[PDB]
Design an enzyme around this catalytic site. Structure first.
Site, PDB file in Angstrom:
ATOM      1  N   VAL A  26       3.046  -5.298  -6.671  1.00 35.57           N
ATOM      2  CA  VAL A  26       2.905  -3.952  -7.216  1.00 35.57           C
ATOM      3  C   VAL A  26       3.809  -2.942  -6.529  1.00 35.57           C
ATOM      4  O   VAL A  26       3.991  -1.832  -7.061  1.00 35.57           O
ATOM      5  CB  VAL A  26       1.441  -3.467  -7.143  1.00 35.57           C
ATOM      6  N   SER A  28       6.212  -2.214  -2.462  1.00 33.86           N
ATOM      7  CA  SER A  28       6.367  -2.551  -1.034  1.00 33.86           C
ATOM      8  C   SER A  28       6.838  -1.310  -0.284  1.00 33.86           C
ATOM      9  O   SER A  28       7.049  -0.266  -0.935  1.00 33.86           O
ATOM     10  CB  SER A  28       7.312  -3.707  -0.851  1.00 33.86           C
ATOM     11  N   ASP A 164      -4.482   5.596   2.811  1.00 35.24           N
ATOM     12  CA  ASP A 164      -3.552   5.753   3.933  1.00 35.24           C
ATOM     13  C   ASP A 164      -4.001   6.826   4.920  1.00 35.24           C
ATOM     14  O   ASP A 164      -3.185   7.357   5.685  1.00 35.24           O
ATOM     15  CB  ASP A 164      -2.134   6.054   3.433  1.00 35.24           C
TER      16      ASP A 164
HETATM   17  C1  LIG Z   1       2.300   6.264  -0.433  1.00 34.72           C
HETATM   18  N1  LIG Z   1       2.018   4.816  -0.499  1.00 34.72           N
HETATM   19  C2  LIG Z   1       1.313   4.378   0.708  1.00 34.72           C
HETATM   20  C3  LIG Z   1       1.006   2.881   0.646  1.00 34.72           C
HETATM   21  N2  LIG Z   1       0.240   2.566  -0.557  1.00 34.72           N
HETATM   22  C4  LIG Z   1      -0.802   1.665  -0.568  1.00 34.72           C
HETATM   23  C5  LIG Z   1      -1.546   1.423  -1.713  1.00 34.72           C
HETATM   24  C6  LIG Z   1      -2.515   0.429  -1.685  1.00 34.72           C
HETATM   25  C7  LIG Z   1      -3.240   0.094  -2.938  1.00 34.72           C
HETATM   26  C8  LIG Z   1      -2.552  -0.319  -4.075  1.00 34.72           C
HETATM   27  C9  LIG Z   1      -3.252  -0.565  -5.239  1.00 34.72           C
HETATM   28  N3  LIG Z   1      -4.576  -0.432  -5.351  1.00 34.72           N
HETATM   29  C10 LIG Z   1      -5.235  -0.035  -4.257  1.00 34.72           C
HETATM   30  C11 LIG Z   1      -4.621   0.233  -3.049  1.00 34.72           C
HETATM   31  C12 LIG Z   1      -2.789  -0.140  -0.419  1.00 34.72           C
HETATM   32  C13 LIG Z   1      -3.841  -1.156  -0.176  1.00 34.72           C
HETATM   33  C14 LIG Z   1      -4.786  -0.982   0.834  1.00 34.72           C
HETATM   34  C15 LIG Z   1      -5.757  -1.941   1.071  1.00 34.72           C
HETATM   35  C16 LIG Z   1      -5.802  -3.085   0.307  1.00 34.72           C
HETATM   36  C17 LIG Z   1      -4.877  -3.279  -0.697  1.00 34.72           C
HETATM   37  C18 LIG Z   1      -3.904  -2.323  -0.938  1.00 34.72           C
HETATM   38  N4  LIG Z   1      -2.092   0.198   0.667  1.00 34.72           N
HETATM   39  N5  LIG Z   1      -1.105   1.103   0.598  1.00 34.72           N
HETATM   40  C19 LIG Z   1       0.920   3.029  -1.769  1.00 34.72           C
HETATM   41  C20 LIG Z   1       1.195   4.509  -1.671  1.00 34.72           C
END
Ligand code: A1B8B
Ligand code: GG5
Length: 334
Positions: A26, A28, A164
């Protein structure tokens, strides 16, 4: 122990339990790789994040521990929480990878503001949810510090979650490097977010830290006598006082056409003096949210032990403490 299967997805390799199927990257970044997946045990679409170099240094190791501790503590409808945490490692010796799992969130507020122009009613709901999660977060003595549209996940139901927990959304006291900023820095970010949703334009699109401050002071005016009295840094004070003084603008004129209740809230949110900013709990009671505000449905958090943040530990200790948190994780009831 569950059974794992292996596959390479965009250079990075993934080793996850069978229960998670149809992995699809989705996005990185510096945080790590995130994959959308289907969870066979619950039937839910989930997001699986693999931490990048979690124990590369003491900084990374502490950061990995902080994030896990932080996510294990958040149980709130408007804050990202942990559905599962795992590693393919069977022992501490072979512990090198950490996987985090949460409910899949399809979009963020950037893909909703740039792709649309939010109505005043949708702004009420979205901002209300932010303040409701921020009350919970702040009740735990936690500061997000980096609230911005891309850190607010949203699904098709317009349900919102904070994650975050030049920066166009950073409070001016941080632009000035005040070492004792409080949780009201987050309120300033909310104010900048609300303004953007109402106008469709970044409120302060600064190009650097200096430009960011001039844009802020153009709107809220230069610091008054009571605020200058609270600045200890002689350099920062000399700068501020040496700028062409500017008056506080009429928010009712800058945000012409908006809901007068929304304008009043912005004025209480975008206050230069942080001692005078509205708190999240106070904002939730503001008339602007009268349609959504339920005082018996805006809970606070259990106590959060942040004592680890001042500890000076070796990498293997941070690693072992993280392993402790993986193994001791208990999922939330279905
Ligand atoms: C500004 N960016 C900072 C980093 N970020 C993300 C988004 C997600 C996430 C994506 C999709 N659904 C839910 C959460 C996650 C994440 C956290 C725990 C478990 C799994 C994923 N960690 N970081 C994207 C936005
Ligand atoms: F120009 C500005 C902009 C923001 C501030 C400010 N707001 N809240 C706290 C401060 C602040 C800034 C620097 N040192 C102490 C306190 C002070 C001057």
């Amino acid at each position: 122990r569950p059974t794992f299967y292996r596959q390479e997805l965009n250079k990075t390799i993934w080793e996850v339990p069978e229960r998670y199927q149809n992995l699809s990257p989705v996005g990185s970044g510096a945080y790590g790789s995130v994959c959308a997946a289907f969870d066979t045990k619950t039937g839910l679409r989930v997001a699986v994040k693999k931490l990048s170099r979690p124990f590369q240094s003491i900084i990374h190791a502490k950061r990995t521990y902080r994030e896990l501790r932080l996510l294990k503590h958040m149980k709130h409808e408007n804050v990202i929480g942990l559905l599962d945490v795992f590693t393919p490692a069977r022992s501490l010796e072979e512990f090198n990878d950490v996987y985090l799992v949460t409910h899949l969130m399809g979009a963020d507020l950037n893909n909703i503001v740039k792709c649309q122009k939010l109505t005043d009613d949708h702004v009420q709901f979205l901002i209300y949810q932010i303040l409701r999660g921020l009350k919970y977060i702040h009740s735990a003595d936690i500061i997000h510090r980096d609230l911005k549209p891309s850190n607010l996940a949203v699904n098709e139901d317009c349900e919102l979650k904070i994650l975050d927990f030049t920066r166009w959304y950073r409070a001016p006291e941080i632009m000035l490097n005040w070492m004792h900023y409080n949780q009201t820095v987050d309120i300033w970010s909310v104010g900048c977010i609300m303004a953007e949703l109402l106008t469709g334009r970044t409120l302060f699109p600064g190009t650097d830290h200096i430009d960011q401050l001039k844009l802020i002071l153009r709107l809220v005016g230069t610091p008054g006598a009571e605020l200058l009295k609270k600045i200890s840094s002689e350099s920062a004070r000399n700068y501020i006082q040496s700028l062409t003084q500017m008056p506080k603008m009429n928010f009712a004129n800058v945000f012409i056409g908006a809901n007068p209740l929304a304008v009043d809230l912005l004025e209480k949110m975008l206050v230069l003096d942080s001692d005078k900013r509205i708190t999240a709990a106070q904002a939730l009671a503001h008339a602007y949210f009268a349609q959504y505000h339920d005082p018996d449905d805006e809970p606070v958090a259990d106590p959060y032990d942040q004592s680890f943040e001042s500890r000076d530990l070796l990498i293997d200790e941070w690693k072992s403490l993280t392993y402790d948190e993986v193994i001791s994780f208990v999922p939330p009831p279905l």
